[PDB]
Every structure is written in structure tokens, then in C-alpha cells.
Symmetry: C3
Subunit: 450 residues, 3 copies
């Protein structure tokens, strides 16, 4: 049968000490709540009802593109009240899963088991085994069904030794939710309407509640503060790294690896320590990434080596290229196959053709460079003091001598040769050699202050 | 009542294999003994008696400014002998706490409890629970008082199972210390005068000894070698990071964060992996620090982003500035609000005014740059081959073309424009355009070696 | 008596998802099998028989220089069959130790104990204690001898609680191996000839089998996939770091330190976080290495400080030199004592004499620079567009002004002074001052687009 999700995401998150609401804090570069939305979508949820409240305007700006029903809750009166805000939209004969926007690590796999376990007209409750369950609601089983959730303050001696506790995550059909939520009261020390009370209500109705245990405690943990958030981040990154290792990516140290997006990879890829991969990154076969590299939204071809401390963003690199160390590729950098980019080089919105080399102390911006060019150390593309910024076009087989300025807009045709120290303002023709005529004064017998 | 401290700091630290004495090795950038001095000061110690010996001259140079009584011990004859060196300076009616200079993690909070627990004319002894107490002196309690410390070699079967052991840290009044230290003997296998024996002596006198348990084993651990020192360092850094996380600083990975000094922070600060903060650093609201940055003695204003692999020292950065990646700020760099400093740029002892940009492959030293200037790629401030190094003064709204050398001392007035490739030796006036007249030789039909 | 080793190294390593065979994957920069070859050599092995198969051509290219007997196995029919391939080469009266090429952490010390424990005409079997021994062959002891290895599926209730299990590593004399290997059958579920069966065969012969327990589980672990490989890497790096710490090297964080080769060190060396040491590196007394440095095949003299994010390869650095931050030394860089190399500087195949400074935004390649030279910011050595690349020779006490190009081949004699912005193509004589005569156009009243 069909499925929809309710995600509880209204909290202020006071102990984050932030201007953001609780669920917008990121794990692996995306809001905690976005992790939960994605998991709900992967489960096959038809609708996702997002209960929100605090930091409402920020929620709407940061999650503007999410396919959710925006359910604006004006007051937090407990979890049952929050779910009831979405209940008018539940289909009678769809399953509804309730999830927490501050618990981003919950897995598709655990939730599939939870859904499959739900008996007709009953509830599947997600539980977790703790070595120290003190403070948490104990699961009481009679046969294979949950007959009660007994809170710490009510439990007798034997019940206190129960390690299985309630997580608050559960699945039931939409009609059952509508019926039982209307029967939840707030007669308790907090004066809140607790979703937890659905278990008692289901048992009152001779409906079955079945428990499913989470495989991992971290799977169900939420973050109330940034220390807990960092714990979630580390667990998530380790799990991501472990998956990649098992797929055949050599990550030298999975504790010093960060993925904040998606990684597509070939075979025999090697990633050294302290690499950060962000956005959508594709690495071909036998790509080697050296220590300290940052790759964001990049495509790297087969057999490329990126040497240490290279930072690349929104760039494409052709097969057998060599980049780094200390190379900077800025958005729109497109390096062809067999190119070479070296230390203290910055390439921005430029194409560099096959076999060309830009190996030192150079800025190339808004440029087209052809194949088998030699761009000398200290070369800079620049503009006049004007309005917009124009293009430098360099053909194939061009030699550009060291410390030359290329002043856009300018074109240098195939086979041209430019001497060191030149200022190029006029177009250079095919097979034209341009050399600067210097005037020097030579003074003999100049004794240095020494 | 008043309090003074005695810190035992005379050791050679042979297993460090160092020319330094034991307690001068650093944790978080400061000598282990300095941690203990500071803790003693925070407890409210009136006097701090520093028992020193080995590496005496180094102790005096490295701790020259510490408010301690320098008690030079000529021979190490045991801990009681060391404390007795300071005893002539104890006030009869002040409390004295004994601390170890190689155990830097001891907390103010534990020591406050220790002091409060001390009965009149008695001793408060700091103890610690170990899962494997083998080798350590077992605490024997009768009622709530310590009647003996039984060493491993003397303990019977049941005593060996006692997990509570002696740390050697204790508090008693000055008069009691003077009396009991004079009664300590050295009749034991080591031939040493042990401070430990004060417990037996107090019990001989019908004085009460009360135990206080350390909350953490690491709190009382000392470092005898650099492996142990690195364990202390990691524990300390984790604790510092955890405190900052709970205060609302987003530290992406607390295991890859180092603070070696003090950090003042606003709200919503984000610090990526492998950042080192040294000296006194102040970060405003919503500061973002990218991976691999090193900040030492810096003030950063609100809304500044420091991009990866930037190294800043003794510098000030105004609000909404953007620094990095691969930027270097050297001492005396002062960047105004809304400034931009980019890759492979070095700024030393220079002021850069509001809105100005220095984005590539540039050295600016000993300079004043005004507001809304454009400092082109490859620009260098330099000097004549002379004696001292002079200043470059650039006004507001100046454009400096790429690969220009500014030869100090020189002044460039408001609104001036300098063409690329220029050598500026003479002052440039207001609204003056300076462009280099190049002489080039053009040779047609130059066929490259290809 | 003499010793030889057999190393099992034929596996495909399917779950690595690699074009390499299993044992060529690296730990600390060298193939797993090379670790085991080296350990075998350190034990005093006269012959090392390398059983290989899958990825045969790669094995031969990657291990071409190893002193092993290459035993090419055409089919994997079990571990006994593999060892039997080498058996014709066993001396009757030498001991033979059997090792696994995918278990690189096995120690010399454990193996020495194993060998010493072997009774005449018997076997010493390496075992390991596991908290969860499920799936592994249980060691049955009667007296102090191993009478059986009982597999999981055969063990009774009490045998299943045995924590001691078989590793498959063992020592016996060559004649015993020849005899017993010929009696191993393949009547089991896998249809394989198991080396394990030698224990049963020895007991059949009234020969003694003695167990020796591994000190560490990780010591005997193999890597079947890259997740396991990364676990081995981390354990190995920690152990290496711990050894260095105990020798007196201050490694600020041993979890963020990598050694991939050998390190020779003096006293009071300090290594900050995220340093990688590769190949053969020698550091003198009081060398300080800042964060993010990479040193490969380098010799560093006493009292050198390498500041953060410096990358050095195949280079020598004299005493009291200062390198970094953001410095690049490429192969053949030789820096004398008291030299200074600064940010965004690249030195390649060049010698730099005592006291000389190259502090910013410079490339020096194929050069000899003498003592007490001042190489200004933006200086570049370059070549004509030609064939091979020629040498720049700079004498002692030379000043090279900022943004000067030195066009090889060229010689600059002692005491020469070169003005900023110069292009040097002709040799400069002793005490010759060369300054560029610029032509500038000055336009007054140029109002900037503002
Ligand atoms: C008093 O200590 C409080 C705080 C104790 N805890 C934490 O601080 C913590 C919270 C979140 C993370 Cl990610 C890491 C640690 C953990 C300690 C381990 C058990 N869980 C709770 C597991 C759970 C999750 C959802 C529903 C029910 C139970 C809380
Ligand atoms: C034989 O193993 C020796 C060495 C055993 N230990 C260490 O090597 C060690 C020492 C210091 C650190 Cl920071 C980390 C480890 C630890 C193991 C855990 C207990 N403590 C001692 C705790 C203590 C501290 C002060 C007073 C009394 C007890 C020593
Ligand atoms: C079902 O879980 C399988 C996998 C379980 N294991 C692993 O995945 C693992 C394997 C290798 C490493 Cl380095 C780290 C972990 C470990 C878990 C700990 C015990 N050992 C085996 C120890 C051993 C080594 C050699 C011979 C005999 C025993 C395997
Ligand atoms: Mg230049
Ligand atoms: Mg120039």
C-alpha cells in the first residue's frame, strides 16, 4: 500500500546557540532535515508533511525546492499535536511514518523493516537497545507485541533492567492516526500531547503493536547541540568512507576524509589523507588525489594525478592530466587531456588544450588556450581599467615567455612565439615572434653596501 | 581561609630524551608546568612555590614572568623532601595544595572539592579509581576516612581488589605540613622521603584523612615520555573543542582541531577540519574558516570568510572581508571591511582600505593602501638595494595594473591609474595615468622548433 | 639451525575491485607482500619462496628486485598445495616458516618465539585469542601440546567456548613438511588441500605440536578488501608514531602523522599535525616541521624550521635554514646553511649558497646561487624557446631586483646588482649594476570610470 511521511521540524534548537532553527544545521553539507526528506523519498513516500515553526522564513529559503507539504505549526504542544497538524491530509488506507528532522541518520533499510512489520490496523514501533536505558521509556513485551511503554519514574525493579526503549518513530495507517490522535490527552507533568500515547490507545482498541529494533543506536540519535551534531557528522563520514572502501576506492585514512555530496568513481582510485569532496564529483579510473585537496563539482578523467594542496571547483579535467601541487582551478576551468598545471597557478573560466602546460606562478582568466602551448612562469592575463572583462585567445603551438602580460581582448595565432617580459596588447599573427627591446644602463664598479 | 600551592617541577624527564627538563614540554603551546601554575592561580592561591632543579636555567628563561616562589632543590630525595623545601614559607593557618608539574590536566573543579573536603587539622587526599590498580597504593577506608595507603607488595588478597588508589595530590594546613614533614623517614626500598607517609602520620595524630575521587583518570595523569604527552594533548584538545561546540561554535571535526591559546567567538562561527588557532584569537559572528587554516594572534570581524590554506599572524581583518585560499597575512597586516585578498598573496605590515582587492600572485609590504583600490595580479612592492626598507603609500580609488613594481619610498595619489608592466619609482599625482611605452621587435615567419 | 620462508601470495583479491593482485596493495607506501618479505629477511631467512599466480606480470615488475624464489602456481587448490610447490627446495634440516602475503603486520618478535618453541621433528603453530571465535578452528590442548584444531561446524558445546584459534602460520623442519604435505588430502566441503591438516598428521606420527599465542590480533590480520587494508594502515602508522614518540620525537598528534619509508632523527625534533614523511628522510637536532608538510627523500640539518604547507622532494637543507610556509623544493634542490626560502617559491635542481634568501613568488630552476644573495620577489629563471634547458649561475653577494627574468644560459658575477623589472640575457660582471631604462607616458587629468 501507499506511504506518506510526517517530519517533525519545528524546533528552535536553543542549545545550538544559533540564528538558524534546529534542523537547518548541516551534516555532510546538507541540512539535517534534508537527509530525512531524502530518506522518506527513497522509501517511496507519496507525500511528505513537514511540520515547521521556528525560523520559518529560513526554513522556506533553505528548503525552497523540497517536495514537501508545508505545515506551519503556531505552537509546540507535543509530538501528537504536531502530527495531528498533518493528519487532515492522511489518506485512510496509506501507511504514515513519523520521523524527526533532527535525527538524520535513520536508514531506509531500518524503515523498510519497520513498515513491513506493521500489522493490519496496528502500529510498528521503532525501538533501540541501550546499555544504560536510564531516563527512557521501557518496552514491555507480552508475546511478540508491545503492551506498554513504561517511563523511568513509573518502572518497577525488573522493568528498570529492560534495555529496549522507545524511539518515538512509528508507522500506522492514516485512518488509525486520525482516530487515535484525537484521543491523546495532555495529563502529564509536561502538559504535552505525546505521540507515545498512541501505543496505549492502540492496545485499548485491541490493535497490535509490534516492535522493530534499530540495528544501530546512532541511527536514531538526534542533535540538540553542536557536540552531538559533530558526533553525527563523524559517524556519517565514517559510514560513507567505509562504503567507498568496500566499492574499491583506496582511502588512505577514512577518519581524514570528507564527502559532502556524491562521488562517482572508477577502479583503482587513490585518495590520500585530508581530502574534501563536495557537490557532485566524478573520478575516472586510476585517479590519484594527493593530501589536502579540495574538489567541488568537478569531473576528472582517467589516469589524472592531482598533487597535494590543490583546490578545484566547477571544473573539468581530461585524461592523463597532471595538476598541482598548490594549483587552483576556479569555476569554468576546462583542461584537456595530457595538460599540466603546476604550483601557484590559478585558472579561471578558461579552456586549455591538449598537451599544454601552465606550470608556475601564473594567472589565466577568461581565456582559450589551444593544444601544445607552453605558458611560461609569471604569465598573467589582465584587462584594461574599464567595464567588463574580455577574452584572451591563444592558438595551438604557442610559446609564451615568462613574466609576459596578455592584455585582453587579444588573439595570439597558431605557432606564435612571445619573448619573456613582454606586454602583449596587439594581436599576434601566425608564426610571429615578438620580443621586447629593453634599454639597460650598465654601471661598472658599483660596490654594494657591503 | 587562605590557600597556597606547591608545584613539584624538578625532574630531568630522562625518557623524553630532551635537552629540556620534564615540565617545560608543551601541551596546547604552553609548558605543562604553566598549566598547573594557572590552575593554582585560578583556585585563588596566594603563593605558588615552584620546586625546581634540573634544567634550572631553562626553567628561569621559559617561565621568567610567572608569579612563583623559586625554590631551587639541589637533590631529589623524595616528594616529602621537595615539599619541605617550601615549608618554611607556609603560613600556619593557610591551606596548602601539593601539585605535580608534569600533570597539567588537573581541574580547578576537582581541586575545589578537594580543598572543601579537608577536615580541620586533617588532610584531603585525591584518589582515583582504576580498573587495573596493580602497582598502585590502595586506599583503605574505615568509616569515611582513609586509615592507610597499602602498597601493591604489602596488600592481602581482598586489598588487591580495591580499585581506589592514591594520586599523591593532597591538601592540608601549613602548620600540619611543617609538623608532619619533619617526621617523614626514608626507611623503604627506594631510600626516599615520600609525601605519601603524611597519611600514616596524620592517623598517628588522631587527625582525619578524607578521600576525594577524581572525576577523570586523565585529570591526574602525568607525562614521563612523549607518547604520554601526546595522549594528554589529544585529551586536552578534545575537551577544548567540546567546550566550544557546546558554546555554539560549529567545529566540523573536533579530532582535527587545535587551539593553542584562547579563542573569543561570536555566534554561528564555522571551523572546518584541520584548523589551528594559536595565541589570542577573536572571531566575530558568522565567521567561516576553511580547511587547513592557521590563525595566530588575529582579530577577525563579523561575516568574514577565510578560504582554505590561509595562514594569518598578528593581523586584523574587518567585517565582510574575504581572504584566501592560499593567502598569507604576516604581522601588522590590517585589512579593512569588505576587502578581498586572494591566492598566492602575501601582505606584511600594511593597511588595506575598505573595498580594496589584492587577488593574485602579489606581495604588499610596508604599505598603506586606501579604499576601493584594485591591486592587479603580479604586483610587488620592493626596495632599492640600500639599508632600511621604506613605505609605499597608495591613495583611494587607485588602479594598479598587473605585474607592476612599486619601488619604495613612493606615493600614488587618489584616483591614479597605472598600466600593466610598469616600474613606479616616482610619485604619481591625483588622477594621473601612467603607462609603459614598450619597444617590441616583430619577426614574421618564425617557425618554432616543431 | 637455518631458516627459510614460504610466502603465500597468489590471490586475485577480488573484493579489492582492482587490476592489481591482492598482495601488491600498499601499507605505508609498500606492497603488503614486501612487508612480509622484509620480516622474513630480518628473521634470518636463507631462502624466501614466493608462491605467486594472479597478476603474475605485475608481481614481477613491482617486486623485481626482491631476493625471492619465484614459484609460479598455475592453480589454487589450497594452502597445502601452495606450500608443496616450494617443498622441493626445502633443506631437510632447515626450519621453514609459512607466512601470508596479505598479512603484513606479523612481527619479527612473535615469529622468533614461534621458531624457538618448535620441538624437534614437530610443529610450532601460531594461535590467537578472540573474544568472538565463531567461525574459526579451535585449538584443543592436552598437556601443553595441540592435539587438534576443531572447526566451528564440528565443535561441541564446551569447545565452542574456546577463545584460542588457528592462524595457519606455522614452523616445521623441511623434511617434515615434505613428508606430511604428501599426505594431505582434499576430502572436505571446499575440496581443498589445507595446510591446517599438518597438525593432525603430526599427531598421527607421535610428533609434538606446540602453540604460541600472538601478542596482538592485528598482527595476524589479513586484508581481503580496502576497508581492512585501511585498518591495517592505521594500526601500522600508530605503531610507527608510538615508536618515534618513545624515541623522543614530539609528534603533536600520532593519529595525524604518516611515515611511508624510514625516518632518521636527532633530539628535540617537533612534527606538527598532518605531516607526511616518505622515502628516506633524515632530520637533525631541533628540526621543527609545521602543519601540512610533505617531505620525500630529504636530508634536513640541525635547527631547521619548515613552516606550514611546504612540499620538499629529493632535496638537502643545511643547518639553521628556514623554509616555508608554502615553499616547494623539487628534486635536486640543495640549500646551504642559514638560507631562507619563503612563500610561493619553487626551487628545482639548484644550489643556493649560505645566507641567501629567496622569499617570495619566485621560480629558480637549473641554477647555482652563491652566498649572501638577495633574490627579489617575482624573480624567474627561464629559457629561450629551444631544445634543452640551460643553467643560470649567480655568484656571491648578488642583489637581484624584484620581477627580474634571468634568461639562461647566463652568469652573474660576485657583487653584481640588478634593478627591478630587468630582463637579463647577457652576462653581468663583478660589481656591475644593471638597471632598466623605462619609457613612460604620463597623462594628467585621467578620470577613472568612477
Ligand atoms: C543523560 O545523557 C543524555 C545524553 C546522552 N547521549 C548523548 O549525549 C548523545 C546524543 C546524540 C549523539 Cl549523536 C551522541 C551522544 C546519548 C547517549 C547514548 C544514548 N542516546 C539516546 C539514544 C536514543 C535515541 C533516540 C530515542 C531514544 C534513545 C543519547
Ligand atoms: C605499567 O603501566 C604503566 C603505564 C600505564 N599508563 C600509561 O602509560 C599512561 C600514562 C599517562 C597517560 Cl596520559 C596515558 C597513559 C596509565 C594507564 C592508566 C592508569 N595510569 C595511572 C593513573 C594514575 C595517575 C596518577 C596517580 C596514580 C594513578 C597510567
Ligand atoms: C564475520 O566477520 C568477518 C570479519 C571480521 N574481521 C574483520 O573484518 C577485519 C579483518 C581485518 C582487519 Cl585488519 C580488520 C577487521 C576481523 C574481526 C576480528 C577477528 N578477525 C580475524 C582474526 C584472525 C586472523 C587470522 C587468522 C585467524 C583469525 C577478523
Ligand atoms: Mg611577475
Ligand atoms: Mg614583469
Amino acid at each position: 500500500k501507499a506511504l506518506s511521511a510526517v517530519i517533525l521540524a519545528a524546533g528552535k534548537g536553543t542549545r545550538m546557540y544559533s540564528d538558524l532553527p534546529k534542523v537547518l544545521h548541516t551534516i555532510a553539507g546538507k541540512p539535517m532535515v534534508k537527509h530525512v526528506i531524502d530518506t522518506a523519498h527513497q522509501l517511496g513516500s507519496e507525500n511528505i508533511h513537514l511540520i515547521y515553526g521556528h525560523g520559518g522564513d529560513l526554513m522556506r529559503t533553505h528548503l525552497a525546492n523540497e517536495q514537501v507539504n508545508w505545515v506551519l505549526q503556531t505552537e509546540q504542544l507535543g509530538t501528537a499535536h504536531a502530527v495531528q497538524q498533518a493528519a487532515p491530509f492522511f489518506k485512510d488506507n496509506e501507511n504514515i511514518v513519523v520521523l524527526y528532522g533532527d535525527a538524520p541518520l535513520i536508514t531506509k533499510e531500518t524503515l523498510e523493516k519497520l513498515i513491513e512489520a506493521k500489522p493490519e490496523n496496528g502500529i510498528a514501533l521503532l525501538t533501540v537497545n541501550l546499555d544504560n536505558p536510564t531516563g527512557y521509556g521501557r518496552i514491555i513485551r507480552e508475546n511478540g507485541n508491545v503492551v506498554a511503554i513504561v517511563e523511568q519514574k513509573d518502572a518497577n525493579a525488573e522493568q528498570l533492567n529492560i534495555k529496549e526503549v522507545n524511539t518515538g518513530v512509528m508507522v500506522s495507517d492514516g485512518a488509525s492516526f486520525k482516530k487515535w490522535l484525537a484521543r491523546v490527552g495532555n495529563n502529564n507533568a509536561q502538559g504535552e500531547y505525546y505521540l507515545t500515547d498512541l501505543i496505549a490507545l492502540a492496545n485499548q482498541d485491541n490493535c497490535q503493536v509490534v516492535a522493530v529494533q534499530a540495528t544501530d543506536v546512532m541511527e536514531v540519535e538526534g542533535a540538540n547541540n553542536r557536540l552531538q551534531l559533530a558526533a553525527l557528522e563523524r559517524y556519517f563520514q565514517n559510514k560513507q568512507a567505509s562504503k567507498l572502501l568496500l566499492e574499491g576506492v583506496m582511502i588512505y585514512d577514512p577518519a581524514r576524509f570528507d564527502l559532502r555530496g556524491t562521488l562517482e568513481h572508477g577502479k583503482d582510485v587513490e585518495i590520500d589523507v585530508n581530502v574534501i569532496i563536495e557537490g557532485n564529483v566524478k573520478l575516472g579510473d586510476r585517479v590519484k588525489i594527493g593530501t589536502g585537496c579540495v574538489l567541488k563539482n568537478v569531473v576528472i578523467g582517467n589516469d589524472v594525478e592531482i598533487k597535494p594542496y590543490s583546490v578545484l571547483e566547477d571544473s573539468i579535467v581530461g585524461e592523463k592530466a597532471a595538476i598541482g601541487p598548490f594549483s587552483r582551478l576556479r569555476p569554468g576551468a576546462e583542461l584537456a587531456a595530457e595538460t599540466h598545471v603546476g604550483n601557484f597557478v590559478e585558472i579561471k573560466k578558461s579552456t586549455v588544450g591538449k598537451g599544454s602546460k601552465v606550470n608556475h606562478l601564473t594567472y589565466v582568466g577568461d581565456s582559450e588556450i589551444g593544444s601544445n602551448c607552453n605558458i611560461g612562469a609569471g604569465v598573467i592575463t589582465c584587462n584594461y581599467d574599464g567595464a567588463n572583462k574580455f577574452k584572451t585567445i591563444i592558438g595551438d603551438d604557442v610559446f609564451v615567455g615568462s613574466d609576459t602580460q596578455l592584455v585582453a581582448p587579444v588573439k595570439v595565432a597558431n605557432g606564435a612565439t612571445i619573448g619573456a617580459g613582454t606586454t602583449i596588447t596587439r594581436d599576434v599573427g601566425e608564426n610571429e615572434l615578438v620580443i621586447t627591446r629593453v634599454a639597460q644602463r650598465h654601471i661598472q664598479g658599483w660596490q654594494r653596501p657591503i
